[PDB]
Amino acid sequence: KAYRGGHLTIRLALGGCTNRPFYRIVAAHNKCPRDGRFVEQLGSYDPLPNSHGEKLVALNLDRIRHWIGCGAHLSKPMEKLLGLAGFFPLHPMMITNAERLRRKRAREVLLASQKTDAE
Amino acid sequence: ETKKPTFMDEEVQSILTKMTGLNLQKTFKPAIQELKPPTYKLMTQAQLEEATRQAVEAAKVRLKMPPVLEERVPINDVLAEDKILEGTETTKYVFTDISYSIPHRERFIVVREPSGTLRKASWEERDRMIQVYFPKEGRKILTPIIFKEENLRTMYSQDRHVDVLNLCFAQFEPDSTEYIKVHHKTYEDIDKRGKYDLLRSTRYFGGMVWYFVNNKKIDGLLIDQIQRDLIDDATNLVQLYHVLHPDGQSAQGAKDQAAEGINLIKVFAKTEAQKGAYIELTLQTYQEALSRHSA
Amino acid sequence: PMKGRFPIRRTLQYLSQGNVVFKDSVKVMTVNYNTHGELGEGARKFVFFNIPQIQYKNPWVQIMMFKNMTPSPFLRFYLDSGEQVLVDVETKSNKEIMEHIRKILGKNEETLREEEEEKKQLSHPANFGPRKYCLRECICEVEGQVPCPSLVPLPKEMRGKYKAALKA
Amino acid sequence: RKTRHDPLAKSKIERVNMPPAVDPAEFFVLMERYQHYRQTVRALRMEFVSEVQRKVHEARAGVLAERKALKDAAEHR
Amino acid sequence: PYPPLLRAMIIAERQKNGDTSTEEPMLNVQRIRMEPWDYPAKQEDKGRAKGTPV
Amino acid sequence: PISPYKDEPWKYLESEEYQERYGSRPVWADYRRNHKGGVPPQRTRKTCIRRNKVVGNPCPICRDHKLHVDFRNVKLLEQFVCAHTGIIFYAPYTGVCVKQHKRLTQAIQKARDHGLLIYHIPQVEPRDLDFSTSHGAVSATPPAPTLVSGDPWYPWYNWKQPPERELSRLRRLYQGHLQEESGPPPESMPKMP
Amino acid sequence: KKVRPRLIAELARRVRALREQLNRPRDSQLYAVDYETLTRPFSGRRLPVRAWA
RNA sequence: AUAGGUUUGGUCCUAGCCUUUCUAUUAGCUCUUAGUAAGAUUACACAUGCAAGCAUCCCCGUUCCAGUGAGUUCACCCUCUAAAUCA
Ligand code: FES
Ligand SMILES: [K+]
Ligand SMILES: [K+]
Ligand SMILES: [K+]
Ligand SMILES: [K+]
């Protein structure tokens, strides 16, 4: 299906069953359906912790580099996965979200302390 | 200066290869598997000897001894520590590089811990991940229960040592702790109960001999070889012991007495061999029987 | 039974036993052979037995056969560069003719091995998807990973039906 | 999804989207992070493009490729 | 500097090929001229609204 | 009924009663399914016992209550495996219902996992051609300068308080739509006492 | 394999392109704005809230 | 297909039909629970609601996704070379 414009993107294709998500990292045309035609499969991502308490991520790093070198864009969740792997720098929004959580939890410790102290 | 032979030295390989032996009937024992109608060929005696020769060549490939490796050192290398990510995630992420054309021991497998530390995966995690993504026939992701002490003792009671060894070779890597432990515990049971013939004409005999020689307990194997009229193998075993323990009483004794053939067994029996008395009696019985047949 | 003399020739097993895979230069192969004469028996046997094997391995090469045009049988190969390779096959057996063309115009065993290894890389063991293309369809098949809900029901805490009930 | 021809819903005629409130300190820090992050990624992308282009050239006109071509020609002759 | 993983993979290739060096791999960011987001774009390549009047 | 062998199921197969009933033939030798036609249905009945009531023609396992399908009753399990090929007979072969065939299959696998039942264990090749552990992937990577000094990998991970002039620009641009300014974040993640 | 020509598809295409050049709206019409409702009367689209000031 | 029934007073040959196996819809009768998958007969007509916005204006997007199976060798390979991504 020849689309008007568009570009290749490395993104997460949702698989699995209800309440059991499983993602396949695929390089697909921007305009293709999420779970439809793809150019190449570049890994996988199980978001459910396994028996060993691990979230398994496979990254075909040789082919990911090839496609980034051919002009493939990246989805935000895919950029964040490569950040956690150490292949790219940590995405700024993970740093900021971590800081937002720190501030939230710091504010939570005040009310908790006041209750135990005042009462 | 003077390097002690390694397991893979051509000299050691020749000795251990001959000590193993080649029983074509045992190497090619009929397997209990899905069967097909056999094929038939009308062959001359010359052609029959050529096919038997080709079977000997194929059997020698099947018996190629696995290399004995030293226990791998635990991997504990931290690539980075991003403390900002501490407390954001509750579970660790295991990232496996699945680039096809990379040797499995040259693949980068790293773990992002909940604390934020990006560390290289442990040997155990590395092996588990390679099975998840490059599944090998006969290997399981979760360690089979057969390898528990209780389950391994039933297998020994049934004289299924070779089966325990084939299971271990499929599940565990040659330099893993579990691999070395199981083979060492199998070798010990063979020694205690004198089941050395179970591993003859198999690729696991050399490893068993290597374990015995380097731990100085070649007494049981020597007795069995003599009782079975395998002096050539018994003499070669004593010779090999001397090469791996050159600064030893028996090695010096043979040097002092220039012992050869049966003499080497006597020199070793008295000086170093723990069961010196039993060896002499066993060797005595054989030499007497041999003298009769000569007449 | 199967019709015709030597019915083995009309079996996929026999057609795949040809060892002559022409180099990409070869475009046309003209087989001139004589129907009678003892000196042309090999060419007649080569046409009877081996042309099916050659064509099966080289589907895009044109094989054209001409009967009783010349006093002696010969092969001529037309290469893409424009070179013409004349192979005289008179007095040779069908086995000799077959081995001769493998040497001069057949891909060696190394070249063929390499092509087969390149095909191996097309299928990646780690990739998940339909059975036609991949070994496993879902990660749930891998032991240790959360099984499929169809087989092993998930805990109520992990199911969206009751996730939003506990919260509200 | 709707097409350009499909008419707009009556409920959305009066809907006005209001931008989110901006935190000055967080806004500036985040802006710089995007500038640095994207500069690092652009350099990485450039490196990956060069590798791809080099590999293609090496396959087309590499010394080893040309050597093989010459060997094949010699063997044919 | 290269990110954690990429750095480890470039150092391993060096050792595998045999090159013994202790220099740190680093990305040359001098070529990348990061312009501000509010820099005037090329109006020549910009489109135009279509004729449909309301 | 209550069989006395549930605790030691292997005993029944060595008792006199068993030898009188079965002898040396497998327990299923005499069973014949009742079905229409010459070709039987490709599945056996689901279960021979429904709500503690046995059907008319109970299968070889369900017709004798003293036969306990247990991973330890190796002699009973062996009867349901091919001696020459080692494959578990499909249920139509012996006539066991689907319920008992599933229990037999699981028990046979459990016995094989415990080493009680012999099966062909093949000799496999090594996974890797080379066993060297010298590559950086498995060895120790030289620590990066930032890791040695304890600094963040990239300087822009850490929060740097913006200059006051820049904060005034943003306060002019977003007049009337401003949040409370946020200072530097906590140095580490707090925790609920 | 001989595709049946579609003449009306080409006629309308040329007519459309032409009309787009002769009836093209001017910048006066396109970029007009009602300063009370702050909407472009050409399209009746509201401007973003951040541009109103 | 491991086959079976059926021509005749009977036998053999040939032959069609049908039986036994496995799936999908619909009908009758009947029906406890949980998980998962799947789910108008009709390219016939459709009440009502919703399905495309975003954004300091310009642009961009609404040409996608989603739907259907009416029509029907426009789908594949090669050659060549637009548009598009690689700031
Ligand atoms: S197929 Fe894997 S979750 Fe269902
Ligand atoms: K019939
Ligand atoms: K029904
Ligand atoms: K816009
Ligand atoms: K249709």
Ligand SMILES: [Mg+2]
């Ligand atoms: Mg172009």
Ligand SMILES: [Zn+2]
């Ligand atoms: Zn039953």
